[PDB]
Every structure is written in structure tokens, then in C-alpha cells.
Amino acid sequence: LTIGNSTITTQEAANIIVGYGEWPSYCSDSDATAVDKPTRPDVSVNRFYTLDTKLWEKSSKGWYWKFPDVLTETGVFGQNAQFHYLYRSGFCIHVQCNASKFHQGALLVAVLPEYVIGTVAGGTGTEDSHPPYKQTQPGADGFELQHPYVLDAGIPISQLTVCPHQWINLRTNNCATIIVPYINALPFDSALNHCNFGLLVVPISPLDYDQGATPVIPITITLAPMCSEFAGLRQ
């Protein structure tokens, strides 16, 4: 893939894995879904937007993101899609971790479409609900889980692999690349209001060093959205 500004080169072992087995496509619209024609080049906004890199402690318990969201005030992607009426796109996302040959651990990069992340509070002591407002727009840094075993959704990682996933074993792979197409009932919904998609990077073997060695492990996420769908509006 030599499309964009600067890449990050790998020895390209077959850690490549496509969402459900079929590539992200464009919209097949030479019929009548919209008489106005959204127009989209492959390299305008398909820049390699690399998020903030995050730390991995022993007591880290996994992290999640939402994707139509994550680009809002993020990149020229967010500066246009907020103003555009409708959105659709595939992704090439690269979760990359840099570690030593003395470190041991296990990460599980997995991909999940409709991610309803809960959640609950205490009980019925004072109030029964209050899910957070800041639940959407988790920043590149955010956010930590609460109960990773159930993904704060009452759903087990034990079977998380049933969704398109990919392993990062510091024994073998420090790099993983997974591609997802667009996934929705409608070929066009709006973006920031509905996050079509969620990404998880959760450790299973919770890492161990022997001290005197850098205790923090970088998990750098690198994104490249393919087959987007836009045109332009006002401001």
C-alpha cells in the first residue's frame, strides 16, 4: 500500500486479515439512491492519521475506541464529515506496539461493529442509571475499561474472537493490521450521531518485566480510512 504521505514499513508477515473476507467497496450507485453525486479521490483524506500512542502497565485492563466518532476535531477527515450530511467508508487500521525482546505479554486486537458499551453505576442506593454523556467521543488516549471480561457490555472476550480479530504476541508479532468495510443496515447513515463501529485492544496475558527495564509498553494505533464517501457543503 503506497498511497498517502509517509508509511511505516514492516517485514509484512501475513498478519494481514480482511473483515469477514470481503474488501471494503465503494457505494454501488448508478441507480437512484441519490441524484447528487458524492465525489471522492483516494488520497485527499486517506492520509495516515496516527493517533496518540498509549501506555501498557501490568494493571492495564484494555482499551476501546469508536471510529466514525474518533475523527471529529481529528484531522481534515473530521473537519468535513461534521459538515457533510452522510458518510460511508472502509478502514485499514494498524495497531503497532514497540517492545523489547525481554518483555512478555499478549494483546488481542479485535473489531466490533455495533458497540453498546453499557453501562451501570452502583446500584439502587441513590439512583438506578446515569450512563455517561462523554461515552461517545473517546479521544485517541481514551478510554480505559471497567470490566474487560465483559467489555462493560455483559459480553465475554472469551468469544471476542468471533468478530474479526488479530493477535499481538510479543513472542512473535509486534505488529497487526486489520481491514474493515462499511457495516450498517442503511448504505448511508449520519456519522457523529451513530458510531457504526468499535475497536478493542485488550491484553490477556497482563505483561511482566523484571524491573530496571522500561515498565511502559507503547501501543501505537495507525489509521487509514479507505473507500470514504463525501463531496462538500458550507461553513
Binding site: 469477514y20 455495533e114 454523556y133 461517545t136 470490566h147 455483559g154 472469551s158 443496515a185 451513530h194
Partner: protein, 225 residues
């Protein structure tokens, strides 16, 4: 046991499950009127909910069956009315409402002497397929932060609602109970999900308890069988 017939979604789903138990007593304090609106939840069959949360999106037609009896089980010479009203259409408020005579609300007249009525409801959603949970606030456009209990539930996943009457200007003579069974037909599903492991609290969000249970325990130690 070499056959994939029982591993199709259809065989996995083709079975009438009890989803409605509506009581119309002679008089009491549930609905002293002789009148009940039944919003059409599939969650009525309890286990069906986890059974369908195996997937994200799925799609099907639905065959409804209406068995009516007394709380005794006496089959009784009563003629009643089933009315199915679409998602858009308004629900009746009173027994003497005008909505019962509204033509665009398909209606069924049967007797208990007559075997249970049976109708088929097609795929209703304006979407191409149903959706069990919407990872967003269901408003298109700017967000309304007056209320935020409106989360995850997709409203156009609602496939209408059923209403029942003891036909007649005067109140019933006999205490009746209608039971509703749903069978799913041409089922096609899509994106696979891990299956539920904790108990449900509400029916609009996959919320869980403030103390996690374990999908299997009591194993003593890893060495002993």
C-alpha cells in the same frame, strides 16, 4: 447425525414461542375496561433475546398465533377482535375509541369456538434489516440532552403493536385470556457476536450488574478433574 438441517438459522428459529399473555377478566384492577394494547416485543419469549443477540442485524417474517381461553381453560362462546396497528399508526386509548374502525388497521374477528386465529406479519422496518442495538443516539442531527435514557434502542426496529377487544357495545359476560405465539420464518442474520453471559436488568440496553458473575465456575483447581 450427519445433516446441517438443524444448524440453519431457520431450524434454529422456526418454533412458535409464547410471547403474550393478556388477561381480560370480567372485572378487576389490571384493565377494568376489556381492552389492552400489546406493543410487539420479541423479548416476550425470555430466552429469545440472548438467542437473537448472537447476531447484530437479522431479518425475518413473523407468523402470529392467538389462543384464547378462560383462566379456567373453559372455551367460551365469545367473539373477539384482534387488531394489528402499524408502527406509525396511533394506539387506541379507550374501548370505545374510533381507531377500531380505522381501515388501515388490519383486523381479525374470531370466536373461541373457532380455532385460534393465525396471521403472518411481513418485514416491517424502513431499514433493509432489523437492528438490535444502535451505537448512537437515535436522533439524526444535533443531540438532545434533555433526556439520555434514549440510548441504543432503535425505534424503527419496532414492528407495530396488537390490540384486543371483547366485541360489543356492552362489557363481556365471561372472563377471558388471550395468549400470543410467534414463529419466525424466512430468517437471515449477519454479523456474529459473543453471546450474553450476565443477567439482564433492563430491555433497552445490555447493561449488567455492579458485580460480575462467571459463565462457569466451581472448578476447584486446574489439576483436579
Amino acid at each position: 447425525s450427519h445433516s446441517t438441517a438443524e444448524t440453519t438459522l431457520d431450524s434454529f428459529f422456526s418454533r412458535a414461542g409464547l410471547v403474550g399473555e393478556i388477561d381480560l377478566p370480567l372485572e378487576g384492577t389490571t384493565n377494568p375496561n376489556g381492552y389492552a394494547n400489546w406493543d410487539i416485543d420479541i423479548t416476550g419469549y425470555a430466552q429469545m433475546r440472548r438467542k437473537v443477540e448472537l447476531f447484530t442485524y437479522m431479518r425475518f417474517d413473523a407468523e402470529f398465533t392467538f389462543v384464547a381461553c378462560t383462566p379456567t381453560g373453559e372455551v367460551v362462546p365469545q367473539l373477539l377482535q384482534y387488531m394489528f396497528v402499524p408502527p406509525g399508526a396511533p394506539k387506541p386509548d379507550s374501548r370505545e375509541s374510533l381507531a377500531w374502525q380505522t381501515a388501515t388497521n388490519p383486523s381479525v374477528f374470531v370466536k373461541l369456538s373457532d380455532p385460534p386465529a393465525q396471521v403472518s406479519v411481513p418485514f416491517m422496518s424502513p431499514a433493509s434489516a432489523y437492528q438490535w442495538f444502535y451505537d448512537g443516539y437515535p436522533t439524526f442531527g444535533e443531540h438532545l440532552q434533555a433526556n439520555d435514557l434514549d440510548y441504543g434502542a432503535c425505534p424503527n426496529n419496532m414492528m407495530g403493536t396488537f390490540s384486543v377487544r371483547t366485541v360489543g357495545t356492552s362489557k363481556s359476560k365471561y372472563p377471558l385470556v388471550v395468549r400470543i405465539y410467534m414463529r419466525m420464518k424466512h430468517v437471515r442474520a449477519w454479523i456474529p457476536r459473543p453471546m450474553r453471559n450476565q443477567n439482564y436488568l433492563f430491555k433497552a440496553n445490555p447493561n449488567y450488574a455492579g458485580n460480575s458473575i462467571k459463565p462457569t465456575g466451581a472448578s476447584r483447581t486446574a489439576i483436579t478433574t
